[PDB]
């Protein structure tokens, strides 16, 4: 019957302070001045990779070295990662309901460590990270793999996320979407909170 494929950051995981701490440590190693608010505003308007790019271009540093120190430092801040509100409750609900649960994340293998630290790793049948080999969302290949392997029903398979690229991933792979954002995609179901998800699966 039903399958959820989950995003992590902003959906299940609140990695905000861990990411900022990771960036602060990385900036200290390269002698880059660190202002939390300016970093906060940049990564919200753009992305963490764009921030690395900006300082690499501006300060003549090697972006890949920046990114490897970033990944490394981020992995040291796992203690600062907190679940999003309602995340434990929806995971438990889905599990009890017999919904099969998966992850596709742009995070690396450290995603496994975090989920184990938070006590939620055992919910997932398979966890796909940036080490999986698949092209980043919204490229569909990761989802197609899960459909093919687990014999999932595209009408009852939902990618759950918080960004437009998460809706696109669902659309590109022919599956349904549950998302904080509105979309013109017919298979999107907009939520205001994680607690709304269970309400999708009962009469109105
Ligand atoms: Cl993520
Ligand atoms: Cl990051
Ligand atoms: Cl666990
Ligand atoms: Cl890629
Ligand atoms: Cl991705
Ligand atoms: Mg997200």
Check which CATH number belongs to the domain holding 7 and give it.
3.40.50.1000
Ligand nearest to C-alpha 137: 5
In the 8-state DSSP scheme, what is residue 97? Answer: T
Q: What is the CA radius of gyration of the chain?
A: 18
What's the reported resolution, in angstroms, to a tenth? Answer: 2.1
HEC letters along 6-54: ECCECCCEECHHHHHHHHHHHHHHCCCCCCHHHHHHHHHHCCHHHHHHH
- State how far the alpha carbon of 155 is from the alpha carbons of 67, 147, 186, 188, in Å: 38, 11, 12, 11
Q: Give the Cα separation of 68 and 142 in Å (integer).
A: 24
Residue that finishes a domain, picked among 81, 110, 125: 81
Q: Give the Cα separation of 103 and 111 in Å (integer).
A: 10
> CB within 5 A of ion ligand 3: which residues?
119, 121-122
Residue that finishes a domain, picked among 34, 55, 81: 81
The rounded Å distance from CA 24 to ligand 5 centre is: 24
Considering the domain architecture, whether residues 118 and 168 belong to the same structural domain is answered as: yes
Considering the domain architecture, whether residues 107 and 6 belong to the same structural domain is answered as: yes
Domain that holds residue 117: 1-14+82-204
* C-alpha closest to that of 188 among 203, 198, 169: 169
51, 141, 122, 13 alpha-carbon torsion, rounded to 10°: 30
Considering the domain architecture, whether residues 107 and 184 belong to the same structural domain is answered as: yes
The rounded Å distance from CA 79 to ligand 5 centre is: 23
Considering the domain architecture, whether residues 115 and 180 belong to the same structural domain is answered as: yes
Check which CATH number belongs to the domain holding 24 and give it.
1.10.150.240
């Amino acid at each position: 019957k039903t399958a959820f494929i989950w995003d992590l950051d902003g959906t299940l995981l609140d990695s905000y302070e861990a990411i900022l701490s990771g960036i602060e440590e990385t900036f200290a190693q390269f002698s880059i001045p660190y202002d939390k608010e300016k970093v906060r505003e940049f990564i919200f308007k753009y992305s963490v990779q764009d921030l690395l790019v900006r300082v690499a271009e501006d300060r003549n540093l090697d972006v890949e070295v920046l990114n490897q120190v970033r990944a490394q430092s981020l992995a040291e801040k796992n203690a600062q990662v907190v679940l999003m509100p309602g995340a434990r409750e929806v995971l438990a609900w889905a599990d009890e309901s017999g919904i099969q649960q998966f992850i596709y994340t742009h995070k690396g293998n450290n995603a496994f460590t975090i989920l184990k630290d938070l006590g939620v790793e055992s919910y997932f049948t398979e966890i796909l990270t940036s080490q999986s080999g698949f092209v980043r969302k919204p490229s569909p290949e990761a989802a197609t793999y899960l459909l093919d392997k687990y014999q999932l029903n595209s009408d009852n398979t939902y990618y759950i996320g918080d960004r437009t690229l998460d809706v696109e991933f669902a659309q590109n792979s022919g599956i349904q979407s549950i998302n904080f954002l509105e979309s013109t995609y017919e298979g999107n179901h907009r939520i205001q909170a994680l607690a709304d998800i269970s309400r999708i699966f009962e009469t109105k």
